[PDB]
Design a protein around this nucleic acid. Structure first.
Lengths: 79, 127, 100, 113, 98, 150
RNA sequence: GCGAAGAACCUUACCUGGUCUUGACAUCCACGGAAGUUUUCAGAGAUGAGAAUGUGCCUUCGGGAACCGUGAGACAGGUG
RNA sequence: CGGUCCGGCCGGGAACUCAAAGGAGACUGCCAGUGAUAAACUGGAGGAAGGUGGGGAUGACGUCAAGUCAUCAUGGCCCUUACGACCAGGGCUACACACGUGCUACAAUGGCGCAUACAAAGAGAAGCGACCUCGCGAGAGCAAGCGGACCUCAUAAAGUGCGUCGUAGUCCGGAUUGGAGUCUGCAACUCGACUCCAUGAAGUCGGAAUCGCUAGUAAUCGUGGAUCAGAAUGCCACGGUG
């Protein structure tokens, strides 16, 4: 829940995710956004999101789906 | 024959009516003990009413509107003394000695700055 | 306030009248998705995201005279401090000091 | 005994006998007492057949006790082994409920001298 | 379904407009029900006089005007036919809806 | 320099003809909730009689006339110096203080109902055994010091 | 709990990464187009390119008003 | 005053109340004493009330090295392929550390669920949303009335009844940790608001450092609205009890 209608990704990112597997053994795709919800339609792979300075690698989990990538990627420093 | 009086107190207003007959007291279409809740002393409606002998020969009828239920009792006392001062042309003088003819001039406050309603002037700063 | 706020605001009101204002009662069926009716409105709902600049409003309405978005009374259309200045000049009819 | 499945409490209070076990809390007890039409007071001794086992589908409707009790052993690596904000904010005195960190951290951040 | 409004700035002007409107009502047909006044209201607006902050110093301005609603007890537009052709002083405003 | 407006008059009790017996409805009052403050007034005197109370129609006088204070504390200035003295209590306050010590003995202390605590303290006042409270020990502990002035 | 009668987008400062430079806003002069509507492709998006369609208003038959994309010499612009 | 099984329910009216408007009343005026037989003060009388009658409007030379150029104008002043500003995202709710202000529990005058009582002031036709319902519930339905003294939010709480439980580290308390719903939007990771079911260390009206208050005052419990897709426990407004 955020949201009850159901989350979505934008067409320029959908075009990349539907061509990301393939083998799933390549270098992490720069998806940039920390807002993306890891809801059960999403495929299990490693992706990279922006922290404001660089990109950080994170995994699309199967033990839980009720999350957004900002709950796993740290975006603030020194605190 | 009817004796009549009116009183205002703490945003309530009363009308009091007295007739000859058999003794009773009626308020807002019920008996007196069934109004004002459980009471502390129940005495301000009785204060002047003893002076013409309590529930002996007078038929007492009351209607009262507005304010808190304590204010309605105060409005009734002035309605009783406004009726008693025309029951005998000498009775007002003994009611004066007891203070039952006096009225307050203490109405609701306006702003006036800085006040929450009537007190608590700003915040009294910090140590 | 900027002079661009006089055109930009009313262009964004014309945007709302193009895409949302005559579609506001229909929001109880097009933006409803599942709670009522059936699965037939998802291609119709693409209109709710057809523009991309202002969604439910993206702005606040301003006092014309001062250009300010807050501190103004809609019973006059005017900034509340300027309502007292115009009252001290005797320019607003029926409005005067208390006494008191 | 056995008022909402295979329960082992005997001569406990009418409202509080299945508390602190993922079993049956006070508001659910107050609801089933009124649905069974039985006394809501003191320790149970008088109980008949056809009263409350015939109403199990209010008090034990889907999940109770072992269905939710001790369920952390397989939900811990997503917190302690996967890098996440809530994991660091399990191992440090930093709050998550939107409260202040500049003010009155005490003690919640540990000692102090 | 028939709605009437009368607005003025003075307690004599609200009556001298009521007087012509109730004469128009009586002339249109006898009814003996009495026109609706409903309570006149006023409003006041507090302002802070310091050019930045300070709420411990105020000033107070108030605006007073009179409102009446009249009400017609009949459903028929022949009851307002001449009322919608009436001329009054500039200091009063009338608004009629059918 | 004691400058205040004239003291506040009240009327005598309609049943007992006294302005002091009219005071019991203000004792053990909180939140301005005088409604519940009267709910233990005269209604505990039978509970008291069913312990050790005697003369139930006047068993309330023990907190007015059977337990009475007389000494107050502490200081008097004499030029540039301060010295300890035992002072006198004003006669109306002196009759109306033992009925007021009861707050710690009923809310900070005591078993079951506030009415039973009221009867508990009125039992002890009939034999003057009342357990001392902070609002009495803040005077009584110091009242026997400096018996030689300056 | 102070301007702030209210910041997920805005606002908006400050900061990051993009982009433009006579300017988002105003005006003096021309060029090609009415203002627009419908809509796809690339890009985070502004934009940058595609697939189509208008000619109305006012008026001495001339020509304007208005407004979109362009460009100098004057000159704008800043919650500095 | 009338219709009337005996309620403003209805003819119909205008006393109280409310909302409006005018005019009276209190003037040290009357008496005494005091005072400088002046100004003035205190009692007594009458009165609703006396004593600049009460409360409001409000303030000089200078002071505080006051406060504000972002409410307005404006000197000098910084910036120009830019400090212009358009776009997508972040931040203004950071926390090695210090201190105010608001509030709850510890119950017993109580907690919680039902029964019953009184407002004041506002605001609402793509809204406020009734009654009657669905549901553990926020809320949403079946859908009326209403352009606001007419319909609606709406229910005054403290109080008074009725049940349950009761000095128990407690049926409470809450740190600590989660789930399942309800609302607004394109979308609430980040910086939004309600509800239900669980998790369960401490909690005996209290450290340094300490406040406001002389009476309708201290105290305590209620209600609206602005800003607005959209948040109030803050702020402006309006009342019981004491």
């Amino acid at each position: 829940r955020s949201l009850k209608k159901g989350p979505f990704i934008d067409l320029h990112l959908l075009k990349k995710v539907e061509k990301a597997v393939e083998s799933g053994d390549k270098k992490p795709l720069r998806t940039w956004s920390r807002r993306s919800t890891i809801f059960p339609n999403m495929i299990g792979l490693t992706i990279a999101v922006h922290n404001g300075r660089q990109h950080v690698p994170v995994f699309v989990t199967d033990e839980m789906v009720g999350h957004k990538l900002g709950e796993f990627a740290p975006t603030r420093t020194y605190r | 024959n009817q004796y009549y009086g009116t009183g205002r107190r703490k945003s309530s207003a009363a009308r009091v009516f007295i007739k000859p007959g058999n003794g009773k007291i009626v308020i807002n279409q019920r008996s007196l003990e069934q109004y004002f809740g459980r009471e502390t002393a129940r005495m301000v409606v009785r204060q002047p009413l003893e002076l013409v002998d309590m529930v002996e020969k007078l038929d007492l009828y009351i209607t009262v509107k507005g304010g808190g239920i304590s204010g309605q009792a105060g409005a009734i006392r002035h309605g009783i003394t406004r009726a008693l001062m025309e029951y005998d042309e000498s009775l007002r003088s003994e009611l004066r000695k007891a203070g039952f003819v006096t009225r307050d001039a203490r109405q609701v406050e306006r702003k006036k700055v800085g006040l929450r309603k009537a007190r608590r002037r700003p915040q009294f700063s910090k140590r | 306030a900027k002079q661009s706020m006089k055109a930009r605001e009313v262009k964004r009101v014309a945007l709302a009248d193009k895409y949302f204002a005559k579609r506001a009662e229909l929001k109880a069926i097009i933006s409803d998705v599942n709670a009522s009716d059936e699965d037939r409105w998802n291609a119709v709902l693409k209109l709710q995201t057809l523009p991309r600049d202002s969604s439910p409003s993206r702005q606040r309405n301003r006092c014309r005279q001062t250009g300010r978005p807050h501190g103004f009374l809609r019973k006059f259309g005017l900034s509340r401090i300027k309502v007292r200045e115009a009252a001290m000049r005797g320019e607003i009819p029926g409005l005067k000091k208390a006494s008191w | 005994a056995r008022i909402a499945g295979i329960n082992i409490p005997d001569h406990k209070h009418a409202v509080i006998a299945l508390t602190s076990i993922y079993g049956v809390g006070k508001t659910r007890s107050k609801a089933i007492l009124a649905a069974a039409g039985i006394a809501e007071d003191v320790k149970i001794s008088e109980l008949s057949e056809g009263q409350i086992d015939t109403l199990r589908d209010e008090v034990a409707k889907f999940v109770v006790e072992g269905d939710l009790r001790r369920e952390i052993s397989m939900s811990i690596k997503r917190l302690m082994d996967l890098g996440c904000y809530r994991g660091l904010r399990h191992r440090r005195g930093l709050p998550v409920r939107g409260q202040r960190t500049k003010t009155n951290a005490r003690t919640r951040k540990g000692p102090r001298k | 379904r028939i709605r009437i409004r009368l607005k003025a700035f003075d307690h004599r002007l609200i009556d001298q407009a009521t007087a012509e409107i109730v004469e128009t009502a009586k002339r249109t047909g006898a009814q003996v029900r009495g026109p609706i006044p409903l309570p006149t209201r006023k409003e006041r607006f507090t302002v802070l006089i310091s050019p930045h902050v300070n709420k411990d110093a105020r000033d107070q301005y108030e605006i007073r005007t009179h409102l009446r609603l009249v009400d017609i007890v009949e459903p028929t537009e022949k009851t307002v036919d001449a009322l919608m052709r009436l001329d009054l002083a500039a200091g009063v405003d009338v608004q009629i809806s059918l | 320099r004691r400058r205040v407006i004239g003291q506040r008059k009240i009327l005598p009790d309609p049943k007992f003809g006294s302005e002091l017996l009219a005071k019991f409805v203000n004792i053990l009052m909180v939140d301005g909730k005088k409604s519940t403050a009267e709910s233990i007034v005269y209604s505990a005197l039978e509970t008291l009689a069913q312990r050790s109370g005697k003369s139930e129609l006047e068993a309330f006088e023990v907190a007015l006339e059977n337990v009475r204070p007389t000494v107050e504390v502490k200081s008097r200035r004499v030029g540039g110096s301060t010295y300890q003295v035992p002072v006198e209590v004003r006669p109306v306050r002196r009759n109306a203080l033992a009925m007021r010590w009861i707050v710690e003995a009923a809310r900070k202390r005591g078993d079951k109902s506030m009415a039973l605590r009221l009867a508990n303290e009125l039992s002890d006042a009939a034999e003057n055994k009342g357990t001392a409270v902070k609002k009495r020990e803040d005077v009584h502990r110091m009242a026997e010091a400096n018996k030689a002035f300056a």
